[PDB]
Structure 1
């Protein structure tokens, strides 16, 4: 803005100052991913959302229940990365709830992106799928991560992935044994592994894949063979590989394939680039809206909007949230009611194939 000093005008001879702050006013940084959990628990009032920052704070707001273990796994499984905020909600009817759709809505305008329901029921999975679709269509992009029960055959997994083929749901096959800060080792259903994967994905930078990131678990109940893992990957089911040929044995997340059945478009198939797309569109929308709508269509606006877009995309390039963009494709056309804007973006892709061609050749040494 620009402001007069004094604010009240003066008629008689005087000096007055007009001051412009746009050059020092800040700007919104890169948005933050926040992780959402819905859980059976003991503790605080049900059906309200708590922002949580510390395990101690969580262990005061909640006690002795699977939600608190889920929060523990969510922070503990990503040691290398900054521990983000978590949004958590106990659920009980004011007895077991018949439906969660009535409660999921209380997340709707929270600043939250990844959802995990702490239950195995396919109906709950469908409910959260519908909710994530709803909010995305409303313009609040979200994703869900989903998992089975304690132990499931490939047949059951394929059945579930049939029941939910969706670009905003991911299914986690493996269930395993974790080790807890309480000095406890517990067998858990696969959705707790999905909690771990959501913690890692929400910790990672925007547009960074969970594929081939390590996972920390005491054991897995199902150790899938190479053909088994290829089968599940073809079906768009996330699987955990036990690395055995290395001297050190550890568990990899094999891939970040969504449950969606068509692999031809990566923006729908792969979580990372879909997330990058979601954040890029959301930030473009909200920033252009608050920047320009209602402003006067002064003759130079065709410059100013191009300069704004080029600045924004330069900032996106700086953070490695896009690969590159052509500056000259940023083009603006102004008509009396409307700004019409064109841009090209090169998005950032994770490496998923490396092909080495090795040519043996002779050289004649001589002396």
Structure 2
């Protein structure tokens, strides 16, 4: 803005100052991913959302229940990365709830992106799928991560992936044994592994894949063979590989394939680039809206909007949230009611194939 000093005008001879702050006013940084959990628990009032920052704070707001273990796994499984905020909600009817759709809505305008329901029921999975679709269509992009029960055959997994083929749901096959800060080792259903994967994905930078990131678990109940893992990967089911040929044995997340059945478009198939797309569109929308709508269509606006877009995309390039962009494709056309804007973006892709061609050749040494 620009402001007069004094604010009240003066008629008689005087000096007055007009001051412009746009050059020092800040700007919104890169948005933050926040992780959402819905859980059976003991503790605080049900059906309200708590922002949580510390395990101690969580262990005061909640006690002795699977939600608190889920929060523990969510922070503990990503040691290398900054521990983000978590949004958590106990659920009980004011007895077991018949439906969660009535409660999921209380997340709707929270600043939250990844959802995990702490239950195995396919109906709950469908409910959260519908909710994530709803909010995305409303313009609040979200994703869900989903998992089975304690132990499931490939047949059951394929059945579930049939029941939910969706670009905003991911299914986690493996269930395993974790080790807890309480000095406890517990067998858990696969959705707790999905909690771990959501913690890692929400910790990672925007547009960074969970594929081939390590996972920390005491054991897995199902150790899938190479053909088994290829089968599940073809079906768009996330699987955990036990690395055995290395001297050190550890568990990899094999891939970040969504449950969606068509692999031809990566923006729908792969979580990372879909997330990058979601954040890029959301930030473009909200920033252009608050920047320009209602402003006067002064003759130079065709410059100013191009300069704004080029600045924004330069900032996106700086953070490695896009690969590159052509500056000259940023083009603006102004008509009396409307700004029409064109841009090209090169998005950032994770490496998923490396092909080495090795040519043996002779050289004649002589002396």
Q: Quickly name the TM-score band, shorter chain normalised.
A: over 0.9
TM-score (norm 1): 1.00
Unaligned runs of 5+ in 1: none
Question: Which residue in 2 is equivalent to 1:239?
Answer: 239
CA positional deviation for 1:325: 0.0
Task: Give distance in 2, aligned partners of 1:336 and 1:22.
Answer: 26
Deviations along 1:214-248, one digit per CA (max 9) or x if unpaired, are 00000000000000000000000000000000000
Deviations 1:156-189 (A, max 9, x none): 0000000000000000000000000000000000
Following the alignment from structure 1 to structure 2, what is the Cα–Cα distance between the partners of residues 24 and 255? 44
CA distance in 2, matches of 1:231, 1:244: 19
CA distance in 2, matches of 1:217, 1:42: 25
Local SS of the residue matching 2:155: helix
Distance 2:143 2:355 in 1: 32
For residues 92 and 13 of structure 2, what CA distance do their matches in structure 1 show?
71
Provide Cα deviations, 1:59-117, integer angstroms capped at 9, x if missing partner.
Answer: 00000000000000000000000000000000000000000000000000000000000
Distance 1:147 1:312 in 2: 37
Unaligned runs of 5+ in 2: none
Distance 2:29 2:341 in 1: 23
Structure 1 Cα separation of the partners of residues 72 and 274 of structure 2: 27
Q: How far does residue 134 in structure 1 lie from its aligned partner after superposition?
A: 0.0
Secondary structure at the counterpart of residue 157 of structure 2 = helix
Partner secondary structure for residue 88 of structure 1: strand
Distance (whole Å) between structure 2 residues aligned to residue 178 and residue 5 of structure 1:
64
**How many residue pairs end up in the alignment?**
367
Root-mean-square deviation (CA, aligned residues, Å) is 0.0
Which residue in the other structure is 1:323 paired with? 323
Query: What is the alpha-carbon distance in structure 2 between the residues aligned to residue 326 and residue 223 of structure 1?
Result: 46
Distance (whole Å) between structure 1 residues aligned to residue 314 and residue 245 of structure 2? 43
State the alpha-carbon separation in 1 of the partners of residues 204 and 135 from structure 2: 23
Quote the Cα distance in structure 1 between the aligned partners of 2:37 and 2:117.
6
User: CA separation in 1, counterparts of 2:318 and 2:68?
Assistant: 37
For 1:359 and 1:236, how far apart are their aligned partners in 2? 36
Structure 1 position 344, deviation (Å): 0.0
1:241-320 correspondence runs (5 A) = 241-320=241-320
Deviations 1:17-53 (A, max 9, x none): 0000000000000000000000000000000000000
Helix, strand or coil at the partner of 2:186: strand
Partner of 1:120: 120
